[PDB]
Design a binder for this molecule. Sequence first.
Ligand code: PXG
Ligand code: PXG
Lengths: 384, 384
Amino acid sequence: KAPEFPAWPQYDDAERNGLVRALEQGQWWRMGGDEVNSFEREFAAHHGAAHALAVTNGTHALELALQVMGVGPGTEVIVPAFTFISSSQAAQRLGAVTVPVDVDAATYNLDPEAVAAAVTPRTKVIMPVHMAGLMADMDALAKISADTGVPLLQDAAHAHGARWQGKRVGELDSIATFSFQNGKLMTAGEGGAVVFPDGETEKYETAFLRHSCGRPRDDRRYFHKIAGSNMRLNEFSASVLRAQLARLDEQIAVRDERWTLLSRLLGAIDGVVPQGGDVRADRNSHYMAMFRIPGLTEERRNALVDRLVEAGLPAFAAFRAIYRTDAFWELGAPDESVDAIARRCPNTDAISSDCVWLHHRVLLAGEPELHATAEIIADAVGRA
Amino acid sequence: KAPEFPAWPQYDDAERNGLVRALEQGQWWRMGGDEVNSFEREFAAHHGAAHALAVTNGTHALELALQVMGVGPGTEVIVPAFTFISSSQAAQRLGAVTVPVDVDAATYNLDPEAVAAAVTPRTKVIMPVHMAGLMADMDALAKISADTGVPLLQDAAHAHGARWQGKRVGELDSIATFSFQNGKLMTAGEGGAVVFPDGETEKYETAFLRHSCGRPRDDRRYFHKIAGSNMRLNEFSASVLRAQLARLDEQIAVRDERWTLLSRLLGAIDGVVPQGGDVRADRNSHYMAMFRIPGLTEERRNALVDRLVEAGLPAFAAFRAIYRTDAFWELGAPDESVDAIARRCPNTDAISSDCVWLHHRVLLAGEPELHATAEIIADAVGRA
Ligand SMILES: Cc1ncc(COP(=O)(O)O)c(CNc2cccc(C(=O)O)c2)c1O
Ligand SMILES: Cc1ncc(COP(=O)(O)O)c(CNc2cccc(C(=O)O)c2)c1O
């Protein structure tokens, strides 16, 4: 029969006790308990960050980080055109213009040359996404950052526990955001965080204020200081996140061994090219096991996904080019046309139609199951 | 010694089992579990609504309801000047102009005449707040609504289980929003909901889409349809909300008996005037036990709060006039000056400085403790 992969999410007594501990504090919001506060320190420490701010979800961690980095009406935000819609939707929500840029053909990370060209006097932030756990070129990006003076924002939703040139997400000198959505590498069904490197304490304080209806942590008289929203995380969610956190490093360790095996097996299938590597990214979190089948239309790629699901695999189409979603064109759209953005985003334009991913739970399975998985793929790709 | 009041929040085995049940579904977001879905139906039914949409918090339920009711740049939203900042902050977040209007001197609900005067060609929504559980004049308001054609949005954060002219919040023909923040009448530490009356299915569908990154519930290929954000509630929070819901009606029943007693005891203190009633509001939820001490400056009212807390009471200053917060003036501010808004908001202007509230947990206590509470108040108000 079909191969079997470990469940996701996973839990055990840590989660069980955590939810009880949160419950029995008798206070369920961060102002009366200690679960969110403790999770923030544990999360930040794990990432080498000066501070962490746990929030309702990864899309709001992006909206908050952008907002304290000055994003707003009149500004532009550069984002990879290949990514989950939240990456641009967040800038759109703040009234800014999202400027989508091409990505690398092999890693699928934001392309540095492409961003250098898209820079403008309106650019307020450049947002690399560490695609499927593989960091983007933070050196090349950091250099464009200095030359232009446009700060970087890492969309680290796929990269919990990732490392670039030995450095943790939070030791790269830029703010970064995470997601704890159900399918993420650690999860409480929903959740997010904003992590602030050493030197960004002010933005951290402002972020706290904007995430709590502009209210000082100790205000009693409703002296709301600035605009914002409520993006507070509850204590129940925080306690489940603290148990997830504790298995993260080792889960990533099993995935790194398993991807080594799968990448090679896949790269052996004619027509099939697994996501590329980058040796400066010393610790790839392995959020997705991604591969292209260059030349496939969307419809053939979609049909192949369906055959893979039918054969017992947790396989998906990969992200749609963000300029090909209606959502993107509803507000803050760039003056270009759709073909004009596609013309300068040829890698996105193809990966949008030919890239497949399997759930990161496959990368926890045994070697036998990865062999069985790649046979299934090899057969199905013959018929695609 | 000081009187003692029942804890808040409260829980028992219902919460315990609920969190386990959520946990052991092994899927923690609404797309894989049934807790949010079930809570939505239970909540809607409880309110007589056609549909309910559970969301991250009450401030986002307001942002979502406004957004599907067309709020945006170029529009105005009328809100009571006396209320929690989220009521205006939500319109501000969508790029609209919040137009604060006066409230009744006795119930502290949005004043109908004051809204009639503030109506404009830009007005897109009028937002009554049911202050401390006491509904606003939904008849007078519904009439202004028809004459102008400006739809109403009920900010029902304080009014879970409330009734106007025998009708439930969701049977009033207008969308309404709730909060499940820690101090609310039912809570999971954080949470919110949008409830949609019969006839508003379209806005419900659009609301679902905007609350999930514009993604159709069944999309697999990232066809994001419209702008929005992520305001999805997690399964853990939903299961705690379903156990809270089940005690609500009876908790409100104990509060209604206790307020009858306290209102009278308080109204007997010279200088002291308890929130007024309204017999068309047949079921007052009793979110706060509120009273004015007309003529007190803020500083005396604040000092009296402190003495009440020192005497063992869970007493607070009441909301600040929203035109007196810096937050309000940061974005979407109305062209008027601060004194110009104060001049047409004389009740808010005074209640902002002279109104005190006690936590609704006091209204669960025994009669002896309410007597002890009103003695404490009577002494302290002598010295204020
Ligand atoms: C790159 C990236 N950035 C930000 C977000 C936002 O996170 P929240 O969901 O916590 O707001 C994400 C989320 N990623 C995500 C979320 C939901 C479904 C799927 C899917 O691939 O089917 C992917 C993401 O993948
Ligand atoms: C009238 C009203 N409207 C909307 C909100 C927003 O709900 P969330 O908090 O779920 O986003 C509220 C919240 N009310 C509230 C929340 C936090 C603290 C205090 C306090 O009085 O000290 C009051 C409120 O009281």
